[PDB]
Design an enzyme around this catalytic site. Structure first.
Site, mmCIF file in Angstrom:
data_model
loop_
_atom_site.group_PDB
_atom_site.id
_atom_site.type_symbol
_atom_site.label_atom_id
_atom_site.label_comp_id
_atom_site.label_asym_id
_atom_site.label_seq_id
_atom_site.Cartn_x
_atom_site.Cartn_y
_atom_site.Cartn_z
ATOM 1 N N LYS E 154 76.360 88.815 69.598
ATOM 2 C CA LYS E 154 76.011 89.365 70.903
ATOM 3 C C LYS E 154 74.695 90.126 70.845
ATOM 4 O O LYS E 154 73.857 90.000 71.745
ATOM 5 C CB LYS E 154 77.131 90.271 71.407
ATOM 6 N N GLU E 180 78.977 104.209 74.970
ATOM 7 C CA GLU E 180 78.540 103.636 73.709
ATOM 8 C C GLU E 180 79.190 104.353 72.534
ATOM 9 O O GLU E 180 79.244 105.584 72.502
ATOM 10 C CB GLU E 180 77.017 103.724 73.605
ATOM 11 N N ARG E 181 79.686 103.580 71.573
ATOM 12 C CA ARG E 181 80.048 104.145 70.282
ATOM 13 C C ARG E 181 78.786 104.606 69.565
ATOM 14 O O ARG E 181 77.809 103.860 69.475
ATOM 15 C CB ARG E 181 80.788 103.116 69.435
#
Ligand SMILES: Nc1ncnc2c1ncn2[C@@H]1O[C@H](COP(=O)(O)OP(=O)(O)OP(=O)(O)O)[C@@H](O)[C@H]1O
Ligand SMILES: Nc1ncnc2c1ncn2[C@@H]1O[C@H](COP(=O)(O)OP(=O)(O)O)[C@@H](O)[C@H]1O
Ligand SMILES: [Mg+2]
Ligand SMILES: [Mg+2]
Lengths: 53, 35, 466, 477, 456, 128, 128
Positions: E154, E180-181
């Site tokens: 991705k 977001e991580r």
């Protein structure tokens, strides 16, 4: 007869798998519908309990 | 999901139970006469 | 007594009275409107303020507007002068034929008949419909309820019953349109004029119409059923007549109450319905009854929301009926019409000592074979037809033939099907189904029983296919 | 002066609590100091709840709210034709203001039983499947229901474009003015739709009401009623109007938002109890009037989007209970190239059969019967049923933005149901169709003109049709 | 205007003013804090009190603490100086590279373009990727649902879209890491640095990053998509570019909006989502469109809760999606890169009236032969082996080497124009290369490179 | 009254689901907060304080008894609903009736697989 | 403290389901608006700001690390429940355990089809 029967059983099990997949798809639709309804009903119960205070 | 056909109690669980009971009552009659 | 409006929320209006607080259920007239805006008192709020439900639109109401108390609930004209006329929820004529000149007016809110007035006679009412007459027969003076989802055939069935029973009826008839299509009311009006059941020139009319349709605010939709009840109750009590009362659709009644229940300040019940659903329904339905002063045969179409029969409204209606015709969408998609579910429709005169042992045995055998087919349906769906026994295949074939033969072409359905309608006598139905159960037609194809009348038409269609 | 003016007490959840406005009416339009408008929803003993038609960002606590003295109304008239307006009737196409002399309330009650008459005259969509199997009459409410991306807006746009052959002629009776209400759609989709209608010259008789996805929920709630009032203007003046609501699912979602923000008890799928009334009071205003009321009509084509083909859901079943039939669009068919993906065993028109012309009746009775047989079957007798049915379902396909005249549809369905297609293989049917049409258009405008003026097929026209079809089929690949 | 905190409940803060109540959506600055705390007005409660949602933690807040009205919504620096940098929801740098020295600041709350600013006909956005451009093309100003997560490349596809839109169209990109991580945000930052898309030494950076972390309050996660959209709106409306905007993830945007609405006491709708779900999604997505100056095309990563596509969050997101790119592991474990599933990727502009008849017919032939090959593989005739051969060659020719991978693999990256893709697949379908071997199409650009690889 | 005088009585509650509905209406209109399916929190107490009054007495108290046959209507066979499970947990056994068994000719449609009597053979005649 | 001083720590939260339950109780009693399963609106915020504190530091910050192993109990394998969904969304993979695998003799009952590690082989040695 053995060859005729093995062919017939292969096609019959193929058709059974096809029909089982069809029923699985319809029941997955029904299951998602029912789980959404259950979550909504539980939310409505909690909200109506909180609104009565 | 092992054993879920019999666990659902449908038309397939009833026939599964009927098959097991038929087979094993035949086997019990066969095992009792030889005892 | 005169009060003033202090709050307007939707169909709900708070009115503050300086003197003479009107009782609950009284009708109040708003002053300063172009048409008649009637408020029905529902609650006494305290501090000389009442809460009312409006019978019309509340647009244009101003806080402080004057409101007169009539001194009585909504009173509608009752009598033989209402026959052939159309009136709305508050008894006003909506057919442009002038005033309804009765000699008596009755309030739409009345007490239910007592326990000592109840009747027990249970004679059958043959309708000409094979599935109804066979499996769940109607009774004269009883309560019939037609359940069904959206577009399954409740209006078609109730129009077929009007055609098959009301024209052949000796007494009077009342049609209460409750929260339905206005064009359907126009269709019914003009069809009854064409067929002479309504006569615009003399006093030979046999039907009274009361319409509050789905374009009406919730108050009118909640009380128009009561208005129709009042007309039918006059015909039953003061005339002693045998009355036919068709209510399409009664579910709207309940639904209308729901729409106001929040504005009345009540804690919602299950699925958002009013907490008073069952007692409101009971108060309404207990007046729809046969007493030992006169008979009322009632046919009520009952909408089933989202096809869910466990919904509180149809589930509560189930207990008020003597016969239930439950229409099914799954059966309607098989082309079988009427879409009556033969294993979900019941009747209280389906009793050997009432319909005869022959009728009872044929009905019970039909239901047995249909239940057995339904039990086999799973294996038939997965493992195909060939994995059954011989008696199982015979059961499947006979059950499918019976499913087809339960369908029937209606005369109200002639327009969009071309097939001429069929009125099958009860004995011919019993005979045809006895013969199919016996096996006398195990050689004919199942398509020969689809959309026919008597079994002779089935064998004729079989000889026409081959 | 707290009788004609008020001060905002609170603003939020799309509702403004206002202090004052002692003489304001229920459901009256009020004007905020920032230029926005609102509707008086809750008259209370100490405040007025106002539904804001716009963003709550523009309204602050302490702002002045004047009252306009008018119950919520929209401009109506001939002057809206060709214009793109928002839910309040303000032009959003930059072509200047609307020069309307008449205003009409958006919440007027539908006509009663007496002002109506049965639906008798046809509303031509130009789509063979609709015009033949699911005929729509003027004054009818026909629902277009289906999954996402199944061709619903395409059916509505084909109908609007088709009305051009009647709006250009001199038959004032057969004219149909169109209204397209976009509710919760993308704004770019509505712009491209207006472009499509401008290319086909279909805008000069069309009003577009736009309440798109970025508009406040009260505007998406109000848009269908504004459009319906613009249509009632024609319905009440002897003219005929068609209105499309695309779609009522998003209006129901906007109304559920407004209701949940008002702390109202949710029901099935968290929808309010009066979500049926929301659509019933709207779709009841589409009526056919008797001649003592002008004889005009208003036809409604509401659109409903289902989730995974579920037509037994809450809102779909509500609208099915309100309308006079439905046109089902299936995803299975649409994926297989069968377009318009109309399910024929499920679509129905309750009151439209009486409106179908006699020629279309003569061909469509046979077409419908043969299709019913083909559906009920799927040796040497049923094989002919299957062949005829396959040829007919290939004949029912159609392109986009190209509606057909009723006589051309009649000719094509004739060539299909009399049996001149059983020779060809299915993959060629469409080919023949197109070519055949050109032939009948090129050198046979006289038979088409006779069929069109007569409304039926006479034995002379039937013989000419058989001749032309046999000749074309003879010299055709 | 100065006010004071009157209530602190979690991430909700009620602030009372004494003069000049701030409008809704304005940003307020809490005073006397070590780090910048920004509140956003949500409601006017009456009595000169507003309710606000916090953009950061509210620990240590005192009732009576002074709060300044900024006078506008959250304003973020917009310009070419944001390219290659990382900023959070309120526009301050979170990469420790110094201040972002733009000349102008834009408010993150803006109305969508008007009706007369819309483009009236859809055009295609050529990405240079063969499978995308052919089978499921992207529309300018459209939304693309990117399905498939880890292990299907991705990030490689994202960076290649950035590079290809920068080269072919000259349009920059914005990446909004909603929810977001932080570990995966650091990972993405460093993969963008290594692949040259971000350059820390000169001004040749192609993408601007906006990170709303997963450990931030739901208001920050609900507004970070608007921050990224504001950067992209600058690049479109002031430089007439065709901007790319990535939203990863969009389900997290919906989830943050639902959590914010629950915090404000609003009654949940169906399945527990905010009652304003459709209008929140709409007010965000309608700003992603083609105007008369430029356009913004949005690639949005879709997560589906419980694999239920009728769930309100996907069902509301799918109403705005113009295309779909499905990254499949059954294609990656087969050897094809990018791992786009060519039979499940869809497009709304795959229509002969939009992409033309030739493009539509080539794409339909490719899809039909791939479905035929799946059917034939199910049963493993005369010409069906020829269909198998042509379909295997089509599968190989859907592959492509990317530039953002040249350092790791050595193979040069290919930006195939649209005409070359159309004609190459047309020729493979006609049979012009039924003699060339199967692996002469694997990992090549145009079909000329396939014949040049077959020569060897 | 009969139970306390050495006599034996039998009571049928037909049915307790409608009593639960009426109690829910009263409680919701008394503004008591709703619980599961809007029923009040103490609907189990409602039915248990009623069904505990059926009892067999010893000789010192007359030897009378009161048998109770409560009736419960389930929706679509959902035995797992709120009030059905309450009343099932209260009573000394259940007699399950089924629609499938009813239409297959089994009348009364008692489901002997599910129908249990917690007293059992202790309350039968020896011949039976 | 260890992660900040160049050392490496591992932490096991056993389990986070019970912490979410305790937080839900505290929130419901403070009259904060309940959401799905009566959980507050910021329960995801709770677990996410707890779990983002496990980090690998670069060499300029000591090079230390903190690894987190949160534990979550599902009800009948329902990973689509609210708190399982949140914690699955927050973490970098999940070791999934089954009951059928347990009683089939497979101990530890690690379902390898459903288990995933997003760090993957970067967290392994060359031999492994
Ligand atoms: N009769 C047709 N023939 C060929 N293509 C068609 C036809 N109808 C629709 N299409 C194609 O399918 C696409 C989707 O159709 P359309 O937008 O009209 O349906 P929709 O249900 O309104 O979609 P949405 O859910 O976005 O509103 C159209 O862009 C069009 O290209
Ligand atoms: N007895 C019938 N025969 C044939 N079709 C029927 C019959 N009943 C209903 N239908 C079909 O179902 C449609 C809906 O009819 P209707 O009775 O008005 O629905 P509802 O259940 O809402 O009252 C009809 O238009 C018709 O197509
Ligand atoms: Mg009806
Ligand atoms: Mg559309």
């Amino acid at each position: 007869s053995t060859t005729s029967e093995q062919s017939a059983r292969m096609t019959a099990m193929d058709n059974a798998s096809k029909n089982a997949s069809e029923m699985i798809d319809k029941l997955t639709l029904t299951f998602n519908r029912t789980r959404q309804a259950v979550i909504t009903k539980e939310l409505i119960e909690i909200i109506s309990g909180a609104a009565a205070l | 999901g092992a054993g879920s056909i019999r666990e659902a109690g449908g038309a397939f669980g009833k026939r599964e139970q009927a098959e097991e009971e038929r087979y094993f009552r035949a086997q019990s009659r066969e095992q009792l006469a030889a005892l | 007594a005169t009060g003033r409006i202090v709050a307007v929320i939707g169909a709900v209006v708070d009115v503050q009275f300086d003197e003479g607080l009107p009782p609950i259920l009284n009708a109040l007239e708003v002053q300063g409107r172009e048409t008649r805006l009637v408020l029905e008192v529902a609650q006494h709020l305290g501090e000389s303020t009442v809460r009312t439900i409006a019978m019309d639109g509340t647009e244009g109401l101003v806080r402080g507007q004057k409101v007169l108390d009539s001194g009585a609930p909504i009173k509608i004209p009752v009598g033989p002068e209402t026959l052939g006329r159309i009136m709305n929820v508050i008894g006003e004529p909506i057919d442009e034929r002038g005033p309804i000149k009765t000699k008596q007016f009755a309030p739409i809110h009345a007490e239910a008949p007592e326990f000592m007035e109840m009747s027990v006679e249970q004679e059958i009412l043959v309708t000409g419909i094979k599935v109804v007459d066979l499996l769940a027969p109607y009774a004269k003076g009883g309560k019939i309820g037609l359940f069904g989802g959206a577009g399954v055939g409740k209006t078609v069935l109730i129009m077929e019953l009007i055609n098959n029973v009301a024209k052949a009826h000796g007494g009077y008839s009342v049609f209460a349109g409750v929260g339905e299509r206005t064009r359907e009311g126009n269709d019914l009006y003009h069809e009854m004029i064409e067929s002479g059941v309504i006569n615009l020139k003399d006093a030979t009319s046999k039907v009274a119409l009361v319409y509050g349709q789905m374009n009406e605010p919730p108050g009118a939709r909640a009380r128009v059923a009561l208005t129709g009840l009042t007309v039918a109750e006059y015909f039953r009590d003061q005339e002693g007549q045998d009355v036919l009362l068709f209510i399409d659709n009664i579910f709207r009644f309940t639904q209308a109450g729901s729409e106001v229940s929040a504005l009345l300040g009540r804690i919602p019940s299950a699925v958002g319905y009013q907490p008073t659903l069952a007692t409101d329904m009971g108060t309404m339905q207990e007046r729809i009854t046969t007493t030992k002063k006169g008979s009322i045969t009632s046919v009520q179409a009952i909408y089933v929301p989202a096809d869910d029969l466990t919904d509180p409204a149809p589930a509560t209606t189930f207990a008020h009926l003597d016969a239930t015709t439950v229409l099914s969408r799954a059966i309607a998609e098989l082309g079988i019409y009427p879409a009556v579910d033969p294993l979900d429709s019941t009747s209280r005169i389906m009793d050997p000592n009432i319909v005869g042992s022959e009728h009872y045995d044929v009905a019970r055998g039909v239901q047995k074979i249909l239940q057995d087919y339904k039990s086999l349906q799973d294996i038939i769906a997965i493992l195909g037809m060939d994995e059954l026994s011989e008696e199982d295949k015979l059961t499947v074939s006979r059950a499918r033939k019976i499913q087809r033969f339960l369908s029937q072409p209606f005369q109200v359905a002639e327009v969009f099907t071309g097939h001429m309608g069929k009125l099958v006598p009860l004995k011919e139905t019993i005979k045809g189904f006895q013969q199919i159960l016996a096996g006398e037609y195990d050689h004919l194809p199942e398509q020969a029983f689809y959309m026919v009348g008597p079994i002779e038409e089935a064998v004729a269609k079989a000889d026409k296919l081959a | 002066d707290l009788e004609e003016t008020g001060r905002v007490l609170s603003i939020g959840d799309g509702i403004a609590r206002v202090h004052g406005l002692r003489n304001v009416q229920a459901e009256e339009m009020v004007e905020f100091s920032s230029g926005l408008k609102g509707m008086s929803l809750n008259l209370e003993p100490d405040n007025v709840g106002v539904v804001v038609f716009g963003n709550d960002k523009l309204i602050k606590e302490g702002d002045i709210v004047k009252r306009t003295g008018a119950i919520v109304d929209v401009p109506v008239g001939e002057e809206l034709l060709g214009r793109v307006v928002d839910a309040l009737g303000n032009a959003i196409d930059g072509k200047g203001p609307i020069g309307s002399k008449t205003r009409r309330r958006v919440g007027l009650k539908a006509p009663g039983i007496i002002p109506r008459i049965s639906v008798r005259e046809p509303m031509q969509t130009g789509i063979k499947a609709v015009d033949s199997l699911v005929p729509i009459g003027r004054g009818q409410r026909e629902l277009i229901i289906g999954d996402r991306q199944t061709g619903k807006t395409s059916i509505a746009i084909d109908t609007i474009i088709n009305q051009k052959r009647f709006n250009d002629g001199s038959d004032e009776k057969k004219k149909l003015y169109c209204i397209y209400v976009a509710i919760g759609q993308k704004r770019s989709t509505v712009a491209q739709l207006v472009k499509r209608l401008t290319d086909a010259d279909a805008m000069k008789y069309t009003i577009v009401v736009s309440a798109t996805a970025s508009d406040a929920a009260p505007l998406q709630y109000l848009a269908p009623y504004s459009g319906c009032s613009m249509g009632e203007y024609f319905r009440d003046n002897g003219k005929h109007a068609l209105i499309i609501y695309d779609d009522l699912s998003k209006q129901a979602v906007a109304y559920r938002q407004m209701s949940l923000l008002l702390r109202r008890p949710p029901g099935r799928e968290a929808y309010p109890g009066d979500v049926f009334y929301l659509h019933s009071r709207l779709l009841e205003r589409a009526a056919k009037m008797n001649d003592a009321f002008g004889g005009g009509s208003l036809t409604a084509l509401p659109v409903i989007e289902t989730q995974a083909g579920d037509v037994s859901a809450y809102i779909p079943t509500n609208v099915i209970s309100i309308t006079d039939g439905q046109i089902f669009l299936e995803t299975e068919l649409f994926y297989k190239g069968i377009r318009p993906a109309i399910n024929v065993g499920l679509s129905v028109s309750r009151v439209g059969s009486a409106a179908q012309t006699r020629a279309m009746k003569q061909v469509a009775g046979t077409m419908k019967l043969e299709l019913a047989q083909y559906r009920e079957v799927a040796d040497a007798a049923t094989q002919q049923l299957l062949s005829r049915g396959v040829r007919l379902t290939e004949l029912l396909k159609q392109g986009q933005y190209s509606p057909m005249a009723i006589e051309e549809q009649v000719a094509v369905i004739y060539a299909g149901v009399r049996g001149y297609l059983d020779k060809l293989e299915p993959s060629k049917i469409t080919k023949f169709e197109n070519a055949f049409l050109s032939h009948v258009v090129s050198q046979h405008q006289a038979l088409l003109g006779t069929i069109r003026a007569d409304g039926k097929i006479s034995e002379q026209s039937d013989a000419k049709l058989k001749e032309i079809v046999t000749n074309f089929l003879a010299g055709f690949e």
